[PDB]
């Protein structure tokens with residue numbers, strides 16, 4: 001019976017993922033083709049004119065579902081009453097930065113935003129972090145809410161890694177990607193991610209059977225986009241963000257799990273608690289559940305050591 | 321089989337916004353697979369490979385295949401829909417005649433390629449400017465092998481802008497507004513018209529100048545021309561053409577002017593209010609106020625005739 005537009009925040013909204021993402025949300029791809037939406041667009045204060053330009057183009061689309069757009073540089077305004085927050089706002093890695101430098105630069109963003117979400121968002125707000133380093137930014141956000149944000153409602157996006165893996169597997173097998181499911185991206189959204197096809201299927205057939213460098217191609221793909229395009233991914237990252245949220249809210253298809261960076265307390269794999277860690281997940285009634293049994297014993301667990309160690313190092317680098 | 325859809329100018333920003341909408345099903349609906357054939361100039365081939373790579377990385381269930389090329393015959397081979405975003409780049413201080421001549425070279429080659437290898441019922445919309453005249457060049461270049469009712473130019477971005485503006489002026493949701501009309505050329509001589517528009521079921525200073533000036537306002541704010549909203553409009557144009565317009569709704573389309581009910585001259589691509597059914601437009605009659613109404617169109621008619629001559633047609 002609720003008729004109000006659902007309030008959705010997008011941070012980094014003056015950036016290139018934002019540009020690709022906002023028309024998808026406004027057209028109904030996120031919440032459904034008959035669900036009214038209100039967009040709250042956050043970027044930095046020097047980007048306000050740019051944000052006005054995004055708002056103007058959204059107006060010029062004449063989207064029937066787009067009830068209202070707010071543009072702002074104040075997270076307290078952006079997050080006011082929001083149900084969904086897609087966090088693309090993060091400054092770009094500069095030449096000469098180590099991973100630690102990128103973490104330290106973007107950490108402040110997520111401390112400030114976690115505090116704001118806690119202060120003004122809806123109690124049931126669901127967050128996905130896209131901006132890098134994604135898993136650790138998500139952890140920072142959650143910890144900065146001082147217990148006021150449900151830990152099961154803060155996630156990080158590995159869905160672009162996941163979709164890349166689904167597509168690569170489809171290409172290697174010579175089948176339509178629509179038939180391929182249940183690849184897994186374990187761990188960090190970084191070069192330590194563990195792309196895993198051991199449980200993947202084509203229809204219901206184990207993928208290994210339909211195939212007459214996989215890990216390296218998945219890990220290398222973002223760099224390949226930069227080589228070809230001169231810029232990092234945007235279209236495909238927006239698409240993945242929509243997928244991540246859509247599966248979370250509307251549910252995963254029957255027999256299907258998807259990769260999500262989720263809070264690791266009480267996971268069934270023995271991975272250390274207190275991290276945002278990518279696991280295979282089903283979603284139902286707005287909630288993720290980690291699918292158990294998809295690592296091959298202690299051998300399987302040993303496969304995760306490097307990514308666990310990286311995430312623990314990042315957590316320390318974040319002051320957490 | 322998948323419907324083969326060509327997009328020219330596919331390495332540009334409209335193309336970047338447009339291709340994921342097509343691939344996700346927005347163009348032809350939720351159960352129609354598509355094959356994307358992406359054309360741009362040969363120096364843009366690496367950029368097109370990046371577009372293809374990102375399309376792959378979307379894992380779109382409806383996207384059966386992607387081909388990238390700089391050869392128009394390759395891009396248009398078997399295609400049923402062609403969305404022409406590529407056009408000659410304008411340069412500050414270029415004469416209109418020169419610009420039209422340079423676009424005529426592009427659109428002549430593309431019309432010849434469409435006639436040579438596209439599907440017999442291929443439908444075309446031209447987005448890239450000058451859109452009406454480029455469309456006309458394409459049609460005329462097709463050696464009589466292309467149905468004149470299947471070549472169009474896009475005024476839908478101007479239309480959607482006018483819907484939005486009227487909604488904002490009335491203080492109502494845009495979903496409640498319909499039947500604005502953009503007559504004529506996709507240019508500063510367009511005639512934005514709210515005389516037939518409806519808010520709900522009720523008949524509806526600066527409206528015209530705001531619509532005409534909106535593209536420049538985007539550039540002032542953005543630093544670049546519209547892209548997201550132009551891609552959205554292109555999808556609307558084609559989707560409404562193929563799927564049909566809802567009962568009581570008409571939309572603006574640049575269409576071939578022979579046999580129009582408004583006495584506008586023949587042999588032009590001219591924006592009119594249209595209903596669509598099953599891949600065919602029909603111009604809606606009676607929406608100008610007699611001869612005084614028809615005089616509203618004189619300037620845009622003259623501009624289109626001037627451009628046709630300067631293009632070498």
Ligand SMILES: NC(=O)c1ccc[n+]([C@@H]2O[C@H](COP(=O)([O-])OP(=O)(O)OC[C@H]3O[C@@H](n4cnc5c(N)ncnc54)[C@H](O)[C@@H]3O)[C@@H](O)[C@H]2O)c1
Nearest residue numbers: 011012014015016017042043089090130131132157160237
């Ligand atoms: N799979 C993934 O998780 C994935 C994929 C692609 C990109 N990324 C990351 O997503 C982020 C966005 O990528 P992009 O290409 O759109 O970058 P971009 O530089 O085009 O956009 C980032 C935007 O964030 C804004 N920003 C900076 N601080 C902010 C703050 N305090 N609040 C809100 N906005 C702020 C910037 O001003 C900028 O407009 C980057 O960190 C990028 O590395 C992640």
